[PDB]
Design a protein around this nucleic acid. Sequence first.
RNA 1: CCUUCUCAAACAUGUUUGGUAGUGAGUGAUACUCGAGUUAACUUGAAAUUGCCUUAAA
Lengths: 268, 133, 247, 282, 51
Amino acid sequence: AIPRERVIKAVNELIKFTSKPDDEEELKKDLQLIVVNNKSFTGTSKSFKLKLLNVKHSFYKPWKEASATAVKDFKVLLILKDSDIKKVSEDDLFDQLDSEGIKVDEIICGKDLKTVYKAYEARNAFISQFSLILADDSIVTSLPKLMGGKAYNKVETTPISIRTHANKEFSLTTLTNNIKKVYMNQLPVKLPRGTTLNVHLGNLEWLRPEEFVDNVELISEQLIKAYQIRSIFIKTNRSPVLPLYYNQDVLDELESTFNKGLMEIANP
Amino acid sequence: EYSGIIYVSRLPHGFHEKELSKYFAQFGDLKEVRLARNKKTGNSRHYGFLEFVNKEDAMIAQESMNNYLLMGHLLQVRVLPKGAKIEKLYKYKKRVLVEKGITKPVKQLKDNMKQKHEERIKKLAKSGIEFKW
Amino acid sequence: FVRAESIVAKTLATSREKERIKRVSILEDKKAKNETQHIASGKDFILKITEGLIREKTTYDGKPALLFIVRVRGPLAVNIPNKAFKILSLLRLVETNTGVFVKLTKNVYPLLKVIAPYVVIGKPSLSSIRSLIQKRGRIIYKGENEAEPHEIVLNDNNIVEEQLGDHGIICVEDIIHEIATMGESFSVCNFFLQPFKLNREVSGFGSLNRLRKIKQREAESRTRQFSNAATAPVIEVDIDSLLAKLN
Amino acid sequence: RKLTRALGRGEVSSAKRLEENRDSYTLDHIIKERYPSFPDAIRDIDDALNMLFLFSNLPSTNQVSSKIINDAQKICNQWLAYVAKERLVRKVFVSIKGVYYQANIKGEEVRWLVPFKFPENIPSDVDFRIMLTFLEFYSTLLHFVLYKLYTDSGLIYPPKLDLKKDKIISGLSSYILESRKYDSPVASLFSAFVFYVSREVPIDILEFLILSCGGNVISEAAMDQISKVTHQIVDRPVLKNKVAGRTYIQPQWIFDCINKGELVPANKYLPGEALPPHLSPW
Amino acid sequence: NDVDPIELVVFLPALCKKMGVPYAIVKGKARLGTLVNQKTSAVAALTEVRA
RNA sequence: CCUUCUCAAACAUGUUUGGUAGUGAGUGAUACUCGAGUUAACUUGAAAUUGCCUUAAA
């Protein structure tokens, strides 16, 4: 898969390049993974559903840990069904995620989105302050019309669909368990309609370089089975790229019920 | 002075060419109706132009619809001065994508990507980077 | 005069309806091919709503069923699109306060999904079937010395025998039995019958009748729902109580 | 006027409260003033019966509402069920206009007409407001008279109905008449007889007559929803295989037996034979 | 606009302009009365609104 | 002066598959795949001057 020594040297070289001596001192240290596929990821159809890749090392808790000295702190928004907004109170989440240190800042629903946050200015202002948006999978398919087309231009504002129902009933245990799994293990990735896939690994101050190496190893070994990948790069913002994977063989792939109902309902 | 050309802006989501012509025919005969739209998707730009046969009818339409509050949008209507005719507003459509063919053979594209990888290596060596291969 | 808000609202509602019908058509085409991987669901759901009101979602067994379809007034500010209008014309449901009988099958389900917003669908009981045929039964009958046919009330069993006798249909009760049992010559009986012209539950514009109209509209909004979700279960209501009101 | 004001001001819940908090007029004092004697009321109920049975068979129009039609049908079914249980019919005559029934009610002859189950055409040339006023008065009268008859017979009024039987067949059989030797021979005819009625034979009429001269009825038309049979009533040109132990009859046999009082022999009423003339009992 | 005696409202537009308050003259004290559950109303005002 | 896909099966409360096509204008850097498609983040009142079926009826 990935040479561990080579990727260790790559991460160490990037983290040496980051400190040679506005947003100028902050935007340039975000580590990015570029995946280039031979063919289109989705096909002819756009997708908004983020692909959740599991990693062994926690990611969002370091974000809240390191965001205490930042302008915008890490915030989690949760969107549930309108009929299920009455089954959840803030203490019900507090006593079920106080051990994990997870705090849900604000819970909304479709009615709240369609009434309180209808105007574009209010909608963008409310959305822009949140960093992790988790949605019920039942309601997640109505979200492009409500949250708008601006919210899907960035990864962090793109909603995450999580399973909230057990035995065709609402389950607080299931909802909290899915939230815990997302907060600990999995990361969201934006599947593009081109060939250039971007992964935001995180920030150099969030995690140690060895943990970045392990996470990128697990992501690469998982994506190998996910698709026939072609090229893999690791980079930092405002800096060039470093290749880490290459393969050749996957390049060789480059080159009426309606009328029956009408007949049944018509006379002859 | 004034021409028979009307600039309309802050148009709602559903107001398009057919809607605009249908509404302003009641104020007068229309010589040309155009609506600004995005080139790559069939979405209105929320402004457009109309031309009346009668400049008096253009003035009346403006003084009637200049500050009409419509579906959360306060309409804006102006009469254009002499000259300045309307042009270059084509009715664009929502474009689709299709995969084009490749005339470069497999060996040629492999050689090209090998050369690109070599140039990447040379650029990394240029930029003070000590990385293997 | 025509107001700009009316024009734009009609445009927006018609566009939403076209999007709904397009999504329904694409999904049903994938079902007709039945060899497509990416699909939201590959089966059929019925939502039975009865009476403070209870809704039960079940899976359609696929067995043929007897449905009564009533054409109601559709969504506000909607132009009926071409496919829905074609299906309604074939079902002979071009105007409201009109009911027909339908044989529900697998090829009939997708059309019902397409025409969900304009019709109300139920399962008629034998008493209501007998009441409809005995109370509102009309045929178009052509005489030998009559140059032009005309509509008459289904009053004579002799006409029934002389027009449907080869299939063994002898009288009104035979027609009722064939409609209820969905046997041979079912469509022959259905099209020999004209579509049943019902009457409105609330009529007039006095203060009492306007209050009744307000209550009726509130009840209609509470029961009837358009999901616009391309997979909405076909909604089945208490056609017995509806026919008690409309007949 | 006040409801119009509430709707004009836009106060919908106020209007609903105004509609709830009103009391309608009644005609009980007028009935008791006009009919001081129960025999007088019984003598006058015949036109009421005719009006109710006529109005129950009409379809709903703009002038005539489904609520009024349903109330007429219900009160007619209660009357028919009472006559059927007390076994009080005496004469029956089937004319092209409909069925004339003559019963004996507290020693007085009551004659009335029931139309056939067909969609009769409304002329739109009659004063429907006058007819509806007459119908309201007649409904009050028959409610009072039926209450007295059920109570004097020792039955609960109004009788409760069986909902599933109502949804199977909407007749007098839906209403079960509860409590807390008849006069021979009309009542006692068809004793311990089971009649299987064919689908084309009028089920409401024949069931009413057999129940009135009490015997079991098995309806084929009521078998659509989903041994002991002695007689079977049919009217068809070509009749299928017949069970040997069962007597096949034509519907005129029932009417002629009722009119004569005695048992008219069944050799004259067979499908492969013509019928004798149906004489009027009067 | 149709208040009699008119001095009850004739000072109001100048007062609103002096205090920097948006105002509008509307036709119908009876219409304003329907707004606030009365037969008539000389004036109406919105102070706090929902989000 | 309308009002927005509020979900499915499979295996044993857990696991996997599928389901989401958007207000417009503008600023911009930076890399990737053959005028085509992708790739950090920033502004804004729903902002704007021209890129060839009828009883929801009078």
